[PDB]
Design a protein around this ligand. Structure first.
Ligand SMILES: Nc1ncnc2c1ncn2[C@H]1C[C@H](O)[C@@H](COP(=O)(O)OP(=O)(O)OP(=O)(O)O)O1
Ligand SMILES: [Mg+2]
Length: 425
DNA sequence: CTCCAGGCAAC
RNA sequence: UUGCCUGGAG
RNA sequence: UUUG
């Protein structure tokens, strides 16, 4: 059955190569992704047998404290590389059982479905007159997930008793803190490969309830938001869904993240909207600030690397960043931050020329007139003040950086948009 | 379509 | 987890 | 370090 289908040779190697590819830090054992291929070849006849025999206890997941963009400490769960390999092999065969019957409005942790699908449907709601959204988020969602309510949802379709025991065992596997197992009464491990599927299984009933109620919503993981026409209707259904998920699913709601405010002052998947009747997608202020704070140090504060290297690092990140923020319909702000990127990249190039004599000889080399070369070189104004002067725009400008190998942000923004909406449409 | 090296994003 | 992007082998 |  399904467990035999999980322990199949080809389902194990594809699951293995994934855990290998991720290059995740090692579990409680300390055995890495690099040692995983050699490791399982040695112990498979055992591991296979003892979990075919229902005598396989998985290792406890390892506690790591990582800071979250909000400022909170995210408690991550890191399983043993074998446990990651197994959980992957469960996930791979559990996806086709559960995924097809998941909501059409469910966009988080599902294959063939991205944040862009969630935002395009969301703009539809404010597009068609539902100009109030009830944005929602759960407190420590993965940490609070209820074992009995989860396995009840899991057991509905999954008839093989062997996998239900196995999945419960992974949920029940305690964690390690300074050399002691701490029993997990609540949660699915953050970073467990299977855990994101289990998360959608629980909130599939939340989608079915909202679908029964006949509401116009978009869910990505716990971050779930319903579109209504009025604030009163939104505030009414804010309490009624809070009552639902608190009683039926047994979860507590994050009131700081949850709100009934207007769509374009709230952030949804790194995007926000415009107050317009045809609400255009814009970058959320956080999303802009995260870019700026990343580009500030790709630009040299006191950083000693090759300038061509810096241009490659600045470009590979920006080009990757815009790959995901190509959805926004405001090119103006993209043109501004691109200029700000160049202006930021001028500061590092200016400071590199430590000597007043080195400034003069390079600027003359760049082609700038000798009149302007001696004026700005002897400036008594600050570094950031000199970067925004007429001279350094002329010598080091859009022409210069583009020739020095810098990839244009706005150029690629259009290149991506043009081809892609030619396809879907 | 499969998989490798690397990157970006949402969680 | 998932989506995407550059490069590579089939 | 820092997982999924
Ligand atoms: N980097 C990550 N690795 C693994 N799981 C993650 C990661 N980021 C987010 N998740 C998962 C687990 C989280 O419980 C879930 C929802 O994200 P989020 O709401 O930001 O965190 P949270 O619900 O655990 O804390 P909070 O109470 O602040 O919402 O998404
Ligand atoms: Mg949450």
């Amino acid at each position: 059955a399904l467990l035999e289908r999980i322990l199949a040779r080809d389902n194990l190697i594809t699951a293995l190569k994934r855990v290998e590819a991720n290059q995740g830090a090692p579990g409680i054992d300390g055995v890495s992704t690099d040692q995983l291929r050699d490791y399982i070849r040695a112990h498979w006849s055992t591991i296979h047998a003892q979990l075919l025999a229902g005598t396989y206890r998985p290792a406890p997941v390892r506690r790591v404290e990582i800071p979250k963009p909000g400022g909170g400490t995210r408690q991550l769960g890191i399983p043993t590389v074998v446990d990651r390999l197994i959980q992957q092999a469960i996930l791979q065969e559990l996806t086709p059982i559960f995924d097809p019957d998941f909501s059409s409005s469910s966009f988080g942790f599902r294959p063939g479905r991205n944040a862009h699908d969630a935002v395009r449907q969301a703009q539809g709601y404010i597009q068609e007159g539902y100009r109030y959204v009830v944005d929602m988020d759960l407190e420590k969602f993965f940490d609070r997930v209820n074992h009995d309510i989860l396995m009840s949802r899991v057991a509905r379709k999954v008839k093989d008793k062997r996998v239900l025991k196995l999945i419960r065992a992974y949920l029940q596997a305690g964690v390690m803190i300074e050399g002691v197992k701490v029993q997990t009464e609540e949660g699915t491990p953050q970073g467990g490969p299977l855990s994101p599927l289990l998360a959608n299984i629980l909130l599939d009933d939340l989608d079915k309830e909202l679908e029964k109620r006949g509401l116009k919503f978009c869910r990505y993981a716990d971050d779930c938001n319903i579109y209504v026409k009025s604030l009163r209707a939104g505030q009414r259904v804010k309490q009624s869904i809070q009552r639902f998920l608190e009683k039926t699913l047994k979860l507590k709601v994050n009131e700081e993240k949850s709100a009934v405010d207007r769509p374009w002052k709230r952030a949804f998947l790194g995007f926000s909207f415009t107050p317009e009747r045809k609400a255009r997608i814009r970058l959320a202020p956080r999303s802009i600030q995260r870019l700026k704070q990343r580009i500030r140090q790709l630009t040299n504060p006191n950083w000693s690397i090759s300038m061509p290297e810096r241009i490659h690092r600045v470009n590979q990140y920006v080009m990757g960043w815009i790959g995901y923020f190509r959805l926004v319909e405001t090119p103006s702000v993209l043109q501004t931050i691109e200029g700000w990127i160049r202006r930021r990249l001028r500061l590092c190039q200016w400071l590199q020329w430590k000597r007043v004599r080195t400034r003069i000889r390079e600027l003359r080399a760049l082609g700038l007139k000798e009149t302007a070369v001696m004026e700005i070189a002897n400036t008594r104004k600050g570094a950031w003040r000199t970067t925004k002067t007429p001279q350094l725009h002329q010598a080091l400008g859009k022409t210069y950086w583009t020739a020095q190998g810098l990839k244009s942000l706005t150029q690629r923004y259009f290149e991506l948009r043009q081809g892609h909406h030619h396809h879907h449409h």
